[PDB]
Design a binder for these strands. Structure first.
Lengths: 130, 148, 51, 90, 178, 258
RNA sequence: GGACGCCCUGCGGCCGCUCAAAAGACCUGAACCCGGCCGGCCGCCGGCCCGCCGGCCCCGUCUCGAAACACGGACCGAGGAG
RNA sequence: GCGCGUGGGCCCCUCCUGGUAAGCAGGACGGGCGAGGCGGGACGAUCCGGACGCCGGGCCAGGGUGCGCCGCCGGGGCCCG
RNA sequence: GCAGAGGCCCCGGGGGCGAAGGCGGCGCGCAGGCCCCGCCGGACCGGCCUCUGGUGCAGAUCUCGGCAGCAGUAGCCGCUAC
């Protein structure tokens, strides 16, 4: 329920890299694509251009994949799976899968409380019965 | 396996591995082995010696069966003999019981000599025998008999 | 159209390759009489490789 | 590859690929052909139940100095051979 | 920025591990590497490399060659990273102790009929990881026809046969031809 | 397909792209045109079959039967084998023609839980395959190898279970999903015939046995191997540079008199 | 496959009804585009409470060289080429 | 060993041929652009510096330091830029 | 990342106690992308391992379908007329 202490999580870039000329056209979706033009201001990386994706922006290995709570995430879609995930696991937390129905989530939460594995989405889909 | 292929990785690059200054266009070097005496003489001379010209007499029909002549070396004659029989033969020697191997029956017509026969005497039967082969078997005390 | 600029940089990219050890000591172009006598001298006493 | 050292290909150019007689012969009927020949064979066997499907054929030296040592099966026994046993051809 | 392009000569690439799916070859390589990491014996480093090489760089050695090579020393245990193969020409075969990666069944039968054990690299690690009284042997690497076709057939100093049928006279009969 | 229509490139000068267009002016005959031929049409000339050497096929079938014997390989594949007494499971079952008789055999030999994993695993598929006559998928269960024991009728409708005469074991069956390790309920004739079946293979000789990581570890831990090992030189001390001049103790390591 | 009542000169509207749902001429109902109501003064990138300072030419493409008074491109969706 | 692109190049030096001469036409050592971000030279693909992972300090090249627009004063000489 | 195929998902994977899909909002990843939440929707859908391919689009005077601004614009000026 409480994560091990760990080290400060530093994110090198706060805002997502966006593809060149994403703002100008709806057809160009924000998904990053490498600058490929012969005379692309982006490929050259001229002053005032959007930043380019580089391995340098990599998060510290120990903090990589870790969620803000301090635990990491391993998804669970059933109760058997949750007992396997928590077995010998004080470094991870379980997000109930979106597919899991409201009826089944009650079983997962009740087992999780016994297991001691934190559930990130414990309040999801809670509306009494049918 | 299409997934694990160079072309799929090169998607997203435009020219797809074929260049900008020169692009993939249809047959820009001609089709087939063409221009081997003109534009491609450099390659044909460098890697293809004897490609152009006529060099020999012509047989309008070739009768493969008569031009077929299988040969066996003097080293493998003992190998043809089965092992159980062969191991005793070498210790026993004996002019009277010397092994007869009809290389023709095994499937070879001419005996050439590439190696050395074992000293125990052997009688070889074949359609033809090379002179070095005749000499070596004669040294091992064997006989080069002919077969019909 | 003719121009040889960048030829020396291209040649020196990993060049200045020496000829090879077999080339320096070879029996090619040597005096045929020298070659014949050399084989006879070799074919005697320790150097002889004849069976 | 592009030039370099490649032996030249001796496969002839495809003909009648777009129009004309079908010069491609597919073999996806091959397994079905096997069942068909057995079924025709089974039907024929029953029609002459006591008799063997194959007739007696003669041992014959395989032709050429290449295979002159071995023997194979020929179309039919010679009149002289049948006379030696004492059987007329019919 | 630093000038690292003057006296540095680029990075060569070598086979650190076998690319063979066979888990037994991969296991032996790890074992002979682990031994050489501990005891730096040349024989163990060289075996590790020869296990790693490809089939083309791992040519077969017949019982006949092994007989000639070990003629001086019967005691010494021969080691071949490639498979051993039978020689039908060698009617009589000596007594040999050979650790091969694989033995042709006919060769295995002949060597053991002559009283000599057909060892395996698993046996070698168990008895002599050091390689005391052991010789590492290799097949003629240039025995493949592919190795005699390499080159430009056609230049005057070629000594390389043309690649394909040819059947013409230009160049085929002398430098003066053409 | 797409070639059935008549379309001609209108040509340059009409302010329209040069792609074949019909009488109306409708784009046709191109991979990009709607109704056009695919750029490289699929053909049945493709090689749908891949050749395998007999030896390699036999090696695989044999290593698959061998995998069944490994106790963990079966559990790894996904069979439920805790109640199974032994691997390989050899069961003397006489001719069985009734599912209830076969079910009792399977229950009394430890395989009911595997059969129940299969029975309670039937669901509709996740794709157009549902529509393409492949609607239901079940979990694969035991393989009963039968020789002259006519148990085929009894075991056929049991869920997830399959049958195969020792005459023709199938490698796609032995390893379902290219993952070997299938519980096989051998009839007793099938085991007693395995040495016959595997010798009737012309002069095929079984691949010689090899080693395992544990049997490479035991070999590695042998006294001779450990005795050869020579400990290495003690490693280097790195210690990141700090200014030596600033501190008295720090300067004393390099300049004690100073 | 639309109970009723209310009105409407009338149209039609309005309620609601049937049904799990209007699913109402039809399953889901995206983008473009547009109308109300509300909220701002505004392209992008960075710093900051957030409207100020600083930096930013329009891509693709041939090309020695493109922001080019070179060429193609209104916009969006689907299809589209080792 | 096995391939790929490329086989229209252009500039800055320095020596050139040639033309009366050019952002001219041909040659060559090197470097540069091509395919090299960044700072400066007001502006300039090539000039002067610097040749690039993501960053936080410090140092400081080249060019500058009235104000735009970051950053300077002191001394000697000269003066209708 | 896509779409199928063979397996697995320890009482036999997730689903009317709400699937796929759509719309906004977090979170993780250098990114390709993923995940979860809320809402709509209304029956299917996956993760890993092995396999397959007709497998990823800003352009091609691209194809087809939709549709904007121009724009309540140009115009509705033949045949004498109500």
């Amino acid at each position: 329920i409480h994560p091990l202490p760990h080290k400060i999580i530093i994110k090198k870039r706060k805002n997502k890299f966006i593809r060149f000329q994403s703002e100008r056209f709806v057809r160009v979706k924000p998904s990053w694509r490498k600058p490929r033009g012969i005379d692309s201001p982006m490929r050259h990386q001229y002053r005032g251009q959007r930043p380019m994706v580089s391995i340098g922006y990599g998060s510290d290995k120990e903090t990589r994949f870790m969620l803000p709570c301090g635990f990491f995430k391993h998804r669970i879609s059933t109760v058997h799976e949750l007992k396997t995930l928590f077995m010998n696991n004080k470094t991870h937390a379980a997000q109930i899968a979106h597919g899991v129905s409201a009826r089944s989530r009650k079983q997962i939460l009740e087992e999780a409380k016994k297991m001691g594995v934190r559930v990130l989405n414990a309040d999801a889909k809670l509306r009494k019965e049918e | 396996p299409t997934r694990i292929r160079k072309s799929r990785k090169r998607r997203g690059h435009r020219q797809m591995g074929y260049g900008r200054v020169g692009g993939h266009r249809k047959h820009p070097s001609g089709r087939g082995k063409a221009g081997g005496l003109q534009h491609k003489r450099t390659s044909f001379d460098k890697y293809h010696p004897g490609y152009f010209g006529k060099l020999g007499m012509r047989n309008y029909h070739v009768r493969r069966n008569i031009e077929y002549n299988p040969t066996i070396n003097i080293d493998k004659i003992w190998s043809l003999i089965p092992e159980e029989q062969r191991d005793g033969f070498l210790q026993r020697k004996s002019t009277t019981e010397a092994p007869v191997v009809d290389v023709t029956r095994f499937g070879f017509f001419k005996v050439l000599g590439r190696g050395s026969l074992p000293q125990c005497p052997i009688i070889i039967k074949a359609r033809y025998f090379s002179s070095d082969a005749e000499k070596k078997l004669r040294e091992v005390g064997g006989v080069p008999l002919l077969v019909p | 159209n003719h121009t040889s600029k960048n030829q020396n940089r291209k040649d020196h990219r990993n060049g200045i390759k020496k000829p090879k050890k077999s080339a320096y000591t070879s029996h090619k172009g040597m005096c045929p009489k020298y070659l014949r006598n050399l084989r006879r001298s070799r074919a005697n006493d320790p150097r002889q490789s004849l069976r | 590859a592009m030039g370099r050292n490649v032996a030249f290909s001796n496969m002839r150019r495809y003909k009648c690929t777009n129009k004309g007689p079908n010069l491609i012969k597919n073999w996806f009927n091959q397994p079905a052909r096997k069942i068909r020949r057995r079924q025709t064979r089974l039907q024929k066997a029953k029609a002459i139940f006591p008799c063997p499907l194959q007739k007696l054929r003669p041992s014959v030296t395989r032709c050429s100095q290449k295979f002159n040592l071995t023997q194979r099966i020929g179309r039919g026994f010679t009149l002289r051979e049948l006379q030696g046993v004492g059987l007329s051809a019919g | 920025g630093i000038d690292l392009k003057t006296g540095i000569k680029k990075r060569k690439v070598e086979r650190k591990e076998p690319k063979s799916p066979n888990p037994y070859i991969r296991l032996l390589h790890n074992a002979f590497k682990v031994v050489y990491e501990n005891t730096g014996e040349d024989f163990t480093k060289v075996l590790t490399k020869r296990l790693c090489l490809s089939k083309t760089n791992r040519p077969v050695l017949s019982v006949s060659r092994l007989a000639h090579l070990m003629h001086k020393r019967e005691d010494k245990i021969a080691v071949v990273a490639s498979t051993v193969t039978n020689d039908e020409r060698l009617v009589t075969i000596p007594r040999m102790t050979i650790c091969a990666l694989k033995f042709s069944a006919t060769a295995r039968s002949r060597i053991e009929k002559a009283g000599g054990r057909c060892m395996s690299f698993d046996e070698l690690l168990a008895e002599k990881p050091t390689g005391d009284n052991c010789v590492l042997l290799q097949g003629r690497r240039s025995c493949r026809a592919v190795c005699k076709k390499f080159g430009s057939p056609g230049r005057p100093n070629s000594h390389v046969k043309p690649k394909g049928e040819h059947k013409g006279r230009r160049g085929a009969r002398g430098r003066h031809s053409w | 397909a797409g070639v059935q229509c008549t379309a001609h490139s209108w040509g340059p000068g009409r302010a329209v792209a040069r792609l074949p267009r019909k009488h109306g002016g409708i784009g046709a005959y191109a991979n990009f045109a709607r109704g056009g031929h695919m750029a490289h049409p699929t053909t049945v000339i493709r090689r749908w079959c891949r050749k395998v050497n007999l030896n390699q096929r036999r090696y695989a079938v044999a290593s698959a039967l061998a995998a069944s014997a490994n106790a963990a390989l079966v559990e790894a594949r996904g069979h439920r084998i805790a109640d199974v007494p032994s691997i390989p499971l050899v069961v003397d079952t006489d001719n069985v023609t009734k599912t209830k008789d076969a079910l009792a055999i399977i229950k009394a030999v430890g395989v009911l839980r595997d059969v129940e994993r299969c029975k309670d695993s039937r669901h509709i598929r996740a794709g157009r395959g549902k529509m393409r006559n492949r609607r239901y998928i079940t979990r694969k269960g035991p393989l009963v190898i039968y020789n002259t024991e006519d148990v085929a009728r009894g075991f056929r409708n049991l869920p997830g279970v399959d049958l195969c005469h020792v005459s023709s074991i199938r490698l796609l069956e032995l390893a379902p999903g290219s993952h070997p390790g299938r519980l096989i309920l051998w009839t007793k004739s099938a085991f007693a015939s395995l040495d016959d079946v595997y010798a009737a293979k012309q002069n095929y000789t079984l691949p010689r046995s090899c080693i395992t990581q544990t049997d490479i570890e035991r070999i590695l831990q042998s006294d001779a191997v450990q005795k050869t090992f020579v400990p290495k030189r003690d490693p280097l001390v790195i210690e990141r540079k700090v200014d030596p001049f600033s501190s008295k103790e720090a300067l004393a390591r390099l300049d004690p008199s100073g």
